[PDB]
Structure 1
Amino acid sequence: FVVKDIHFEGLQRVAVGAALLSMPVRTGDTVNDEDISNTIRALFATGNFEDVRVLRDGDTLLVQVKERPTIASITFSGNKSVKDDMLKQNLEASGVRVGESLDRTTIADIEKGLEDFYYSVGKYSASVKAVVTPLPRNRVDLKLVFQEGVSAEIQQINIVGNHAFTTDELISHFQLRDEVPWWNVVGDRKYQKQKLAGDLETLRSYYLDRGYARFNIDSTQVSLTPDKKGIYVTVNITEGDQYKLSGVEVSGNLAGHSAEIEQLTKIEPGELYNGTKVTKMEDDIKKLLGRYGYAYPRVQSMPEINDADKTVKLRVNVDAGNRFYVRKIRFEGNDTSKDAVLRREMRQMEGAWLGSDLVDQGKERLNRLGFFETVDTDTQRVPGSPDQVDVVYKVKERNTGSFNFGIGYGTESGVSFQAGVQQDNWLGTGYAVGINGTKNDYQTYAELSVTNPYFTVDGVSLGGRLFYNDFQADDADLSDYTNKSYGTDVTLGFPINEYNSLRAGLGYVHNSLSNMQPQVAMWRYLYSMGEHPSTSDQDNSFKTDDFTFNYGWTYNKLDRGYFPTDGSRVNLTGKVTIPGSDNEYYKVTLDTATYVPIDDDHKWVVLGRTRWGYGDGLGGKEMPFYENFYAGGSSTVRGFQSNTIGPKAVYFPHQASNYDPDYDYECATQDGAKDLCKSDDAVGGNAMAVASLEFITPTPFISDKYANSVRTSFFWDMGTVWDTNWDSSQYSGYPDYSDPSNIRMSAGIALQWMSPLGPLVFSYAQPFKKYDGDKAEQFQFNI
């Protein structure tokens, strides 16, 4: 009974030899009838075999195999609430998936773990079934149905043995409620045992600071009720007899810093015990020793809880490292960012004792960078030394680059368009790049602006502006207002502090205008400029080369640079003119932006976003018609269209406009359109008071892969722009302004979408209060 040939069938992931070697009798090895059945089991033992049938031709063996392996599908059905991938994992927890060998032994272990998964959802009611369905040459489908019946739900927290407080008072610290009523908000509606696990520590920390050092939750028994819903937790506690943290006995290797350590561990002898501050008093020592370069201060309290007077004595056992810990540092996560620029945002310098806070302050500047997505580090000790740590600042940089656009000019009037591109510190080189401009029929516009914040390591923000607007208003050609405007503005942000920073610059405003409107706001301005622009024609010219002076200061208190959450920053910036300017004026503005989190989780932060300004002449003139302030849609009062808040673009009685076109671009023009006219486009005012009142809002159905950076934001937005200089006696046949009474309101929600092209905010907002005509756009896109 020795085999001359075994017959090896049942293949396509198990070959002849993958059969034959997992046959314990090989071709040529002697056979027994037990070796035949040993060939039955050991061939099935590969986990590929629907069957093994070992026979022989006297001795010449014959092995009959049907094949389980690579699974070609797993179907998920009845899932719809839970997505199928969570069900794929417990299927894969059995080592079972598409393209791998079916083991029909673990069919229920797919399912039992899946219903135990369904048990650990917070349900228990599930019986699921993996269904083998064979497929070409060896393959199978393992269809899975998911009878996800009901979940388990908290109904009552039966804390038992509770005697320092009452049960619902302990429930008052917990959150296992249901049914936001028709008069209140209670929030949650579902059970998890991990919520209870957080609640049992909500219970203990509630007792631990009230003195109950020996508080103990004795046991807790979840009601595993029929209905599979009723969850009643038999929370046996022992209240633990509130004691008084009545002396700190801090000791150990204090590294010679025990005096300041004792100040960190200063308590009242006789105040009730607070284990939360007990651990805190160690961490007070820990950063303090870490500030001296003891990166590893082993600081260990011991609450000598003296029940005999209901007190606690706090032995603390300190053990610091040794001084010169920070040897070097590394920066990581800057493949699109030059390192030394972010190292200028690094305040822990190498070859030093560790400042544990020095590591954080550069990272705080890296958190206030905004060219990051996350900022962290790896404070790695170089071992073999109590003075060697290499701090690997792995920081996750920004999705740099950002695009800005209106809606179309391409293939409408030639090869002409609008543009705008941000780079978000191109290659992180200490040069934040944002460029705008447009080639239109109306205007040939180029405009250039870049900064060097690290021309100097102080933070001297070497930044300049340039533009050239060859703007002709191609309405007839130049019959409506021309403006060849160009010039420069270079302003250097000098830091007064790390919270205060100064700004100063000069403005060269070379505008070459000709054949302007018959309108109003420039006239009273150009009459203050000593010119008569044509009230009755459009042939008037006015050139201004304004040599101005710009100034600014900021306050810097806010969390992040790409998604801030708390703080308040104050920003003053205004302008004035110098001898050399064609118009003598000033134009001073200020805006307020505070972050007041009504939800301290920063899912709801008050976003008070207001806009102010006033500017007039400096020699008694007017602040320019190109400098009146504005608001409206796509602004802090968005939901209108833009330039709807303010005095309006109203026209004098008017005639031959150098031929404004025949019933086209009518501005009380000669072609149609007789005398004093107007428009609901705001011409804007020399005084502005508009505001946005926004709120952070969390997004649950949005997958939070970008909802950390995507913030939905409701608002109620109102305000006024007004020209105090405006003649409300000559333009009383027009919308005439001198006052913040045109307080137009539009209200709705904004949708800040942070794409890889930066935050692209979209907004729906309905105008409710409207003054002097607003072009309205209720849903507004702000690229």
Structure 2
Amino acid sequence: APFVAKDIRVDGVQGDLEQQIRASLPVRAGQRVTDNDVANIVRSLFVSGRFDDVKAHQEGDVLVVSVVAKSIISDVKIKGNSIIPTEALKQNLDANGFKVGDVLIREKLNEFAKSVKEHYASVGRYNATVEPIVNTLPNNRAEILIQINEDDKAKLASLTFKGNESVSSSTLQEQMELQPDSWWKLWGNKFEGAQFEKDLQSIRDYYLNNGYAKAQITKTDVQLNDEKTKVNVTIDVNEGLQYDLRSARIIGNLGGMSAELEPLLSALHLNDTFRRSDIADVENAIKAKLGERGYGSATVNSVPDFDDANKTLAITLVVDAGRRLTVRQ
């Protein structure tokens, strides 16, 4: 849709190149320009090889040209490398166009990372990870960082606890199967060794097996290492107040049985420190009991109610019994 380009902005870039883009622009501040002219700019730009993307529209009186330029490589560095010597990894980069000269092509980077993974596997580190990182820098440049873990893991260095008001470090780490100097599989990336999932329970269980029935575990850090041995771990825990059990009131669909279920709240110790494990064993018999009469899908669910103020807690075992059975011969 033709128009007069009073100004001509060029958006993607800085200096160096912003300059040469301008200097080659087939068009002139001031003239009026067709779709066709503008296409000519955009195609000329793409043919250089230098851009992942070029667009061009009118923004009032100015022809704007946005752009996204291939970075060029300032430093290449590798951490975690350890039995493929850096010499050879550096040689590989340099054969695959990741010399410092060069214009980074990002996809070839991931291809390169895959290929190094495949070499680590000809030497039997089938768990290796080779993840490349690109930090971008001004002047249309960037540096490359190849991160390598040749196994996952290495030995666990330190656990550290934050927000543990009342319970000590030393206590919680007896709750945990994972002790220092035992290994710490890190399943690449980002999903805590499976078994550490376990131990976060042990803990939750134990604040709940000892009053603190708000204890949410807040967050968890993992500190790797530069070389990818040793890791430091940090568990952030919010204990909250340490409640007590006053009432133990039941509801819902009990399939008659209210009868013989009410005698079950009884090896409970009302007006004493709350406890999940006790509260559970109730649900267990409640559920065994309902099972006798053929209700063996019955579901208990411990809702609560709080005196934060007066330090106590009101149990509401919502039950219901998934049908009765009746087999008949």
TM-score using structure 2 length: 0.51
- Distance change (3 Å), C-alpha of 1:174 and 1:321: closer
| Secondary structure in 1 matching 2:252 | strand
Aligned to 2:306: 305
- Distance change (3 Å), C-alpha of 1:253 and 1:225: same
Within a 5 Å distance, the mapping from 1:3-402 to structure 2 comes to 108=111, 111=114, 126-127=129-130, 148=150, 151-178=153-180, 189-192=182-185, 193-266=193-266, 267-323=268-324, 325-327=325-327, 351=328
Cα distance in 1 for partners of 2:128, 2:225 equals 12
Within a 5 Å distance, the mapping from 1:573-722 to structure 2 comes to none
Whether the 8 Å CA contact 2:149–2:228 is kept in 1: the answer is no
How far residue 308 of structure 1 moved from its aligned partner, in angstroms, is 2.2
Letter in 1 for 2:242: Q
Letter in 2 for 1:232: N
- Distance change (3 Å), C-alpha of 1:293 and 1:190: same
Whether the 8 Å CA contact 2:153–2:230 is kept in 1: the answer is no
Residues paired across the two proteins, number: 192
| Secondary structure in 2 matching 1:287 | helix
| Secondary structure in 2 matching 1:199 | helix
Whether the 8 Å CA contact 1:293–1:321 is kept in 2: the answer is no
Cα distance in 2 for partners of 1:285, 1:203 equals 26
Q: Deviations over 1:22-46 (max 9, x none)?
A: xxxxxxxxxxxxxxxxxxxxxxxxx
Cα distance in 2 for partners of 1:147, 1:279 equals 43
Whether the 8 Å CA contact 2:159–2:232 is kept in 1: the answer is yes
Aligned to 1:519: none
How far residue 160 of structure 1 moved from its aligned partner, in angstroms, is 0.9
Percent of paired sites with the same residue: 29
- Distance change (3 Å), C-alpha of 1:217 and 1:109: farther
How far residue 326 of structure 1 moved from its aligned partner, in angstroms, is 4.6
Cα distance in 2 for partners of 1:280, 1:271 equals 17
Cα distance in 1 for partners of 2:264, 2:322 equals 18
Cα distance in 1 for partners of 2:322, 2:151 equals 57
Cα distance in 2 for partners of 1:287, 1:213 equals 26
Aligned to 1:387: none
Cα distance in 2 for partners of 1:191, 1:201 equals 17
| Secondary structure in 1 matching 2:241 | coil
Cα distance in 2 for partners of 1:197, 1:280 equals 24
Cα distance in 1 for partners of 2:112, 2:262 equals 58
Q: Deviations over 1:334-368 (max 9, x none)?
A: xxxxxxxxxxxxxxxxx28xxxxxxxxxxxxxxxx
How far residue 150 of structure 1 moved from its aligned partner, in angstroms, is 6.4
Cα distance in 2 for partners of 1:249, 1:147 equals 54
Cα distance in 1 for partners of 2:301, 2:213 equals 16
Whether the 8 Å CA contact 1:174–1:202 is kept in 2: the answer is yes
Cα distance in 2 for partners of 1:219, 1:294 equals 40
| Secondary structure in 2 matching 1:277 | helix
Letter in 2 for 1:254: L
How far residue 195 of structure 1 moved from its aligned partner, in angstroms, is 2.9
How far residue 219 of structure 1 moved from its aligned partner, in angstroms, is 1.1
Aligned to 2:103: none
Structure 1 consecutive aligned stretches of length 4 or more whose deviation exceeds 4 Å = 107-110
| Secondary structure in 1 matching 2:196 | helix
How far residue 148 of structure 1 moved from its aligned partner, in angstroms, is 2.9
Cα distance in 1 for partners of 2:180, 2:157 equals 8
How far residue 269 of structure 1 moved from its aligned partner, in angstroms, is 1.5
Letter in 2 for 1:161: G
Q: Deviations over 1:384-419 (max 9, x none)?
A: xxxxxxxxxxxxxxxxxxxxxxxxxxxxxxxxxxxx
Q: Deviations over 1:191-210 (max 9, x none)?
A: 24323221111111010010
Greater helix content = 2
Give me the CA root mean square deviation: 3.4
Aligned to 1:442: none
How far residue 248 of structure 1 moved from its aligned partner, in angstroms, is 0.7
TM-score using structure 1 length: 0.23
Whether the 8 Å CA contact 1:302–1:314 is kept in 2: the answer is yes
Cα distance in 1 for partners of 2:309, 2:262 equals 25
Letter in 1 for 2:299: R
Cα distance in 2 for partners of 1:300, 1:109 equals 53
Cα distance in 1 for partners of 2:220, 2:177 equals 16
Q: Deviations over 1:483-512 (max 9, x none)?
A: xxxxxxxxxxxxxxxxxxxxxxxxxxxxxx
Cα distance in 2 for partners of 1:316, 1:126 equals 48
Letter in 2 for 1:126: T
Cα distance in 1 for partners of 2:289, 2:204 equals 28
Cα distance in 2 for partners of 1:287, 1:208 equals 23
Structure number with bigger Rg:
1
- Distance change (3 Å), C-alpha of 1:241 and 1:255: same
Whether the 8 Å CA contact 2:113–2:130 is kept in 1: the answer is no
- Distance change (3 Å), C-alpha of 1:290 and 1:195: same
Within a 5 Å distance, the mapping from 1:429-440 to structure 2 comes to none
- Distance change (3 Å), C-alpha of 1:196 and 1:163: same
How far residue 149 of structure 1 moved from its aligned partner, in angstroms, is 5.2
How far residue 251 of structure 1 moved from its aligned partner, in angstroms, is 1.4
Cα distance in 1 for partners of 2:314, 2:207 equals 17
How far residue 302 of structure 1 moved from its aligned partner, in angstroms, is 1.1
| Secondary structure in 1 matching 2:206 | helix
- Distance change (3 Å), C-alpha of 1:150 and 1:268: closer
For structure 1, the 5+ residue unaligned runs are 1-104, 129-145, 180-188, 328-350, 353-783
Whether the 8 Å CA contact 1:152–1:191 is kept in 2: the answer is yes
How far residue 171 of structure 1 moved from its aligned partner, in angstroms, is 0.8
How far residue 320 of structure 1 moved from its aligned partner, in angstroms, is 1.4
How far residue 223 of structure 1 moved from its aligned partner, in angstroms, is 1.3
| Secondary structure in 2 matching 1:157 | strand
Letter in 1 for 2:129: A
Cα distance in 1 for partners of 2:253, 2:112 equals 54
Aligned to 2:91: none
Q: Deviations over 1:604-645 (max 9, x none)?
A: xxxxxxxxxxxxxxxxxxxxxxxxxxxxxxxxxxxxxxxxxx
Whether the 8 Å CA contact 1:154–1:191 is kept in 2: the answer is yes
Aligned to 2:79: none
Cα distance in 1 for partners of 2:112, 2:269 equals 59
Letter in 1 for 2:224: L
Letter in 1 for 2:183: K
| Secondary structure in 2 matching 1:299 | strand
How far residue 110 of structure 1 moved from its aligned partner, in angstroms, is 9.8
